[PDB]
Ligand binder design. Structure first.
Ligand SMILES: O=C(O)CCn1c2ccc(O)cc2c2c3c(c(-c4ccccc4)cc21)C(=O)NC3=O
Length: 256
């Protein structure tokens, strides 16, 4: 062996685990910097999916609100991607700590989260790409800076086949195999991500609560928000994708 991975990096800790691969905090020996490196089993259609993640990274390396890519390589029976390390952890971890402490993101902080990820979405979408798995565990924290990561579901905007993202954040039209307005699926997921940050109960994976949200009804939020902000969230989850704002329209919105 003596892996590129082994030879170029000192592995500090495991930071993430999944159905296909783990993420490690590593120090690159030569440059002294810390990176996040995902190491997954080399896969085929599964390989086409794994490569799209690499291709998406290699074109989305220039935005402040998208995790930067450095390198990808294959060795042994594993594929590796070396990304920017965000030292603030995931949004999902911040939200889970807030949950236990009963102190959530305040309206000002929710607006900042919405605007920052909204700018990341505007960049991705400007590249004729959609993310398709926006949720708190795929937003990373680094002024706080929020950065979209996990490009495992990224596809071109006019794709006729799509890999469906997390059920809790999934827009109905996507579940229905209607891919005419893919960018608005990202918008819908961003609104529910902001709801979670606002202190909501864990979102439903299926059943009747799941359908009511998809009717355009915001889950309960345990804090008072301006009507104008609540109304922006509600329109981002409109059952008609064309009524949801585009990312460009979101980032220029008077509420933000
Ligand atoms: O398990 C999770 O949801 C997060 C794992 N994870 C963490 C945990 C704590 C951190 O401080 C950063 C990260 C982290 C990072 C990334 C990932 C990641 C997700 C998908 C593919 C490749 C890396 C997971 C990733 C990344 O690209 N930059 C990152 O900083």
């Amino acid at each position: 062996m003596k892996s590129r991975y082994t030879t170029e990096f000192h592995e500090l800790e495991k930071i993430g685990s999944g159905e296909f691969g783990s993420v490690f905090k590593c120090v690159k020996r030569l440059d002294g910097c810390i990176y996040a490196i995902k190491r997954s089993k080399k896969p085929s259609v599964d390989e086409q999916n794994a490569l799209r993640e690499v291709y998406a990274h290699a074109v989305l390396g220039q935005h402040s609100h998208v995790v930067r890519y450095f390198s990808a390589w294959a060795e042994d029976d594993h594929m590796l991607i070396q990304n920017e390390y965000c030292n603030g952890g995931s949004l999902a971890d911040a939200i889970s700590e807030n949950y236990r402490i009963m102190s959530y993101f305040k309206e000002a902080e929710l607006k900042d989260l919405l605007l920052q990820v909204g700018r990341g979405l505007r960049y991705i979408h400007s590249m004729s790409l959609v993310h398709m798995d926006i949720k708190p565990s795929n937003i990373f924290i680094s002024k706080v800076m929020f950065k979209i990561g996990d490009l495992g579901h990224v596809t071109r905007i006019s794709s006729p086949q799509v890999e469906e993202g997390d059920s809790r954040f999934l827009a109905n039209e996507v579940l229905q195999e209607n891919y005419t307005h893919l960018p608005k699926a990202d918008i819908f997921a961003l609104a529910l991500t902001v709801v979670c940050a606002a202190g909501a109960e864990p979102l439903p994976r299926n059943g009747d609560q799941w359908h009511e949200i998809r009717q355009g009804r915001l889950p309960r939020i345990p804090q008072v928000l301006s009507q104008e902000f609540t109304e922006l969230l509600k329109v981002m989850i409109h059952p008609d994708p064309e009524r949801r704002p585009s990312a460009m329209a979101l980032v220029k919105h008077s509420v933000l």
